[PDB]
Amino acid sequence: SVGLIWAQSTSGVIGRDGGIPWRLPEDLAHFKRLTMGHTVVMGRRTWDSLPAAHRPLPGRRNVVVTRQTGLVAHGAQVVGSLEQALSPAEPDAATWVIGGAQIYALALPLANRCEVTEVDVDLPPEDEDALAPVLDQTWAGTSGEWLVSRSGLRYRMHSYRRL
Numbered sequence: 686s687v688g689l690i691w692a693q694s695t696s697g698v699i700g701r702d703g704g705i706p707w708r709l710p711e712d713l714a715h716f717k718r719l720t721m722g723h724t725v726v727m728g729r730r731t732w733d734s735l736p737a738a739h740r741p742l743p744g745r746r747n748v749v750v751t752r753q754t755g756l757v758a759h760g761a762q763v764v765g766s767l768e769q770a771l772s773p774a775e776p777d778a779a780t781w782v783i784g785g786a787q788i789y790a791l792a793l794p795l796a797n798r799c800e801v802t803e804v805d806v807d808l809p810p811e812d813e814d815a816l817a818p819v820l821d822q823t824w825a826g827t828s829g830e831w832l833v834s835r836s837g838l839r840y841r842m843h844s845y846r847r848l
């Protein structure tokens with residue numbers, strides 16, 4: 686099973702300036718709970734965006750997709766395409782594609798589940814922002830209730846599965 690997991694502003698922003706333009710502890714916790722013990726596949730820019738104590742993501746098999754033959758990514762497995770990332774020598778019951786926008790676009794046709802956090806933060810998109818994938822009619826979903834973070838932002842989780 687191949688799943689995508691991301692958090693986006695309502696406006697569709699997932700990344701800015703090489704990082705994340707909000708802080709949402711409940712989403713970090715959701716992400717860590719869903720992915721612990723499993724494989725996480727990411728693009729090289731997402732690998733470079735990870736803060737020090739999270740590079741590699743502890744307790745997960747980290748797979749980094751790059752065209753740079755020769756890239757060294759201590760704590761991760763480097764592969765040269767998304768198809769390679771999804772063709773492991775050692776299978777995993779759960780593989781999560783964890784970003785960014787470039788890799789989500791390649792992975793969406795291959796995935797059967799998306800776990801989406803929606804963040805009610807007003808972020809007019811800016812020209813270099815990374816943006817969320819768009820789900821078409823081949824996906825159907827369920828939405829949790831709007832919740833308020835301990836840090837103040839409204840947020841909610843959505844779970845989509847391929848029809």
Ligand SMILES: NC(=O)c1ccc[n+]([C@@H]2O[C@H](COP(=O)([O-])OP(=O)(O)OC[C@H]3O[C@@H](n4cnc5c(N)ncnc54)[C@H](OP(=O)(O)O)[C@@H]3O)[C@@H](O)[C@H]2O)c1
Pocket residue numbers: 690691692693698699700701702703704705727728729730731732734750751752753765766767783784785786787788789791815
């Ligand atoms: N909100 C969220 O859920 C979330 C999640 C993850 C990341 N982010 C944010 O999103 C941003 C990063 O996303 P991004 O879209 O800029 O980059 P990305 O998708 O993480 O990484 C892009 C890189 O992946 C590699 N790549 C792309 N297509 C490839 C292909 N067909 N074959 C091989 N390698 C390929 C290339 O690496 P090389 O250049 O090395 O060849 C490319 O530069 C950051 O701001 C990060 O903080 C947000």
Ligand SMILES: Nc1nc(N)c(OCCCOc2ccccc2CCC(=O)O)c(-c2ccccc2C(F)(F)F)n1
Pocket residue numbers: 690691692693705712713715716717731734735736739742743782783784800801802
């Ligand atoms: N729902 C969902 N889907 C994702 N794919 C996702 O990004 C995973 C890649 C970045 O990880 C970081 C980024 C900053 C700090 C810590 C971590 C990992 C935490 C861990 O697990 O050790 C996240 C996420 C997790 C933590 C913070 C921010 C985000 C954000 F990107 F959404 F904003 N949340």
